[PDB]
Amino acid sequence: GKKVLIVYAHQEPKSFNGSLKNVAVDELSRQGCTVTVSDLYAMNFEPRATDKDITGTLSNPEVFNYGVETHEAYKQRSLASDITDEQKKVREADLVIFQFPLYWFSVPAILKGWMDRVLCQGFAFDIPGFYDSGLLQGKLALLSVTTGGTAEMYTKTGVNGDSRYFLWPLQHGTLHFCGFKVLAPQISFAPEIASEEERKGMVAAWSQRLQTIWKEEPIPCTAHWHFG
Amino acid sequence: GKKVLIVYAHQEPKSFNGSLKNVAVDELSRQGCTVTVSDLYAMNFEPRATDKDITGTLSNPEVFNYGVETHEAYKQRSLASDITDEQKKVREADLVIFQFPLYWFSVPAILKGWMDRVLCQGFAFDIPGFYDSGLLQGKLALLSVTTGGTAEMYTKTGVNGDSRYFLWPLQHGTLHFCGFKVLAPQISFAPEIASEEERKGMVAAWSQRLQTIWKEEPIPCTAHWHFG
Ligand SMILES: Cc1cc2nc3c(=O)[nH]c(=O)nc-3n(C[C@H](O)[C@H](O)[C@H](O)COP(=O)(O)OP(=O)(O)OC[C@H]3O[C@@H](n4cnc5c(N)ncnc54)[C@H](O)[C@@H]3O)c2cc1C
Ligand SMILES: Cc1cc2nc3c(=O)[nH]c(=O)nc-3n(C[C@H](O)[C@H](O)[C@H](O)COP(=O)(O)OP(=O)(O)OC[C@H]3O[C@@H](n4cnc5c(N)ncnc54)[C@H](O)[C@@H]3O)c2cc1C
Ligand SMILES: COc1ccc2[nH]cc(CCNC(C)=O)c2c1
Ligand SMILES: COc1ccc2[nH]cc(CCNC(C)=O)c2c1
Ligand SMILES: [Zn+2]
Ligand SMILES: [Zn+2]
């Protein structure tokens, strides 16, 4: 019996993003999976990487190096509880779904801050200890992204480039780096411009894909997949 | 005369980023330029895109849509003042320099939230009015980035892929989108690994480049430049 974490980054429960999150919960629930949702905005999740992320006393109180300090806090069980709460959710999950609108060819800052502060060295990766040596191997990850731009725009010769090109930092630089196998992204192009019925189709595509998510092989998370 | 804004995203004044920011201020100062720095961590800059960013009557109080509400608020002058404060700095600047450490093949969340909240519709772009018709046309922008990974790792055949691939969402999807011309990036690779003379070299290389910044031409911020 499979365990899923949804990390959800939208301000509005009635949004397209909210509905994608809610049918994921509905469908994965119906299947009998264990489901957990991190509703970042509702949590007022802190995005900033600061010295407040370490409790007690610093490994080097004179010069603050966030990566060093968080690595030695993880090893010594002195990370801030908001971090470690999320790390627990990840540790337990077989699959991590990220549900977000595209902000500047990336994730909204609040979700960027989740990646920055939750995926610390010792938990997600070490230096050295990354990519296939990353610490979240055996887990699946999946980006479920909504865009303002059309599919059209997201082509190699289109104004925005191929959508793969913006996935690189997220899928490869982040999710692969950490050991994840990367399920094929779910991209919901341009719902604010789509008709009701097209929107319904995209939600149902997502509901249906979700019926057979566990039968999926990861994408090959390569430069060639993304650029060639 | 020329006017520079440095948007700086590092927690530690004694860091390698801190040194790069200060040599920029020193050199650009020496040349007679007008220089302004937004030290985001020191400002406790808010990264989250929330309904707190609009103080006036919302256009749809039942269903919150951050893009629609911020676009309206900018036109009516009911955005949060922290946003407006940054927009004034950008509007005055001839050149915007971003100084940051690479976090997950991207900017630190606090700086992502600057992008998200400061570059709103009406101020930075319109629909229509983006890419070469973006509202910040006539301005220059430059990413000054530091990394953990070495240069070799950031090559087409190295584990990270070429350095330009991770620049795409920044340079193209954000800066060119808003009309900026983009000067070639300054990438200071792996300062932590480097020797102290090589670190000094990197600082001084940046200072030296800034001597002739105003004579540079922008890159052609296309898919071909980034991906080949
Ligand atoms: C800071 C910022 C940066 C941005 N940067 C980019 C960028 O780089 N690239 C880009 O392409 N876009 C960008 N965008 C736009 C953003 O990606 C899209 O606006 C977002 O993806 C749309 O998703 P949403 O959930 O808010 O849509 P919504 O507007 O909330 O939903 C679209 C419509 O679907 C309806 N809907 C909701 N649930 C259902 C349902 N169950 N069935 C049918 N219809 C339903 C809603 O009611 C609504 O009418 C940016 C936006 C912001 C604010
Ligand atoms: C959340 C997170 C995610 C990351 N993701 C990535 C990623 O995707 N890819 C990647 O490659 N890296 C990544 N890193 C690594 C990060 O990019 C590097 O740690 C960072 O760029 C190093 O810069 P710094 O200023 O912090 O270095 P510092 O550690 O501050 O500097 C290195 C040394 O230079 C010294 N120094 C300072 N000023 C000078 C001077 N004037 N002359 C000589 N020496 C000087 C310092 O004192 C120090 O000893 C990540 C780190 C974190 C925390
Ligand atoms: C994809 O390369 C990455 C990804 C995440 C990372 N975090 C950290 C490093 C290197 C140095 N360590 C710190 C300071 O965190 C790093 C490299
Ligand atoms: C880099 O693309 C971006 C960046 C910021 C943005 N904010 C809102 C949108 C949607 C714009 N809608 C269309 C179809 O043009 C948007 C796109
Ligand atoms: Zn990969
Ligand atoms: Zn471009």
UniProtKB/Swiss-Prot annotation, chains A, B:
Co-factor(s): Zn(2+); FAD
Enzyme Commission identifier(s): 1.10.5.1
Claim: Cytoplasm is one of the keywords in the record: yes
Top-rank taxon, per record: Eukaryota
GO molecular function, a single term: melatonin binding
Spans traversing the lipid bilayer: none
Compartmental location: Cytoplasm
InterPro entries: Flavodoxin_fold, Flavoprotein-like_sf, NAD(P)H_dehydrogenase_qn
GO cellular component labels: cytosol; extracellular exosome; nucleoplasm
Location of Phosphoserine modifications: 78, 195
A Pfam family recorded for this sequence: Flavodoxin_2
Stored PANTHER family: NAD P H OXIDOREDUCTASE-RELATED, RIBOSYLDIHYDRONICOTINAMIDE DEHYDROGENASE [QUINONE]
Annotated function: The enzyme apparently serves as a quinone reductase in connection with conjugation reactions of hydroquinones involved in detoxification pathways as well as in biosynthetic processes such as the vitamin K-dependent gamma-carboxylation of glutamate residues in prothrombin synthesis.
Assembly, per entry: Homodimer.
The protein's name: Ribosyldihydronicotinamide dehydrogenase [quinone]
Organism field: Homo sapiens
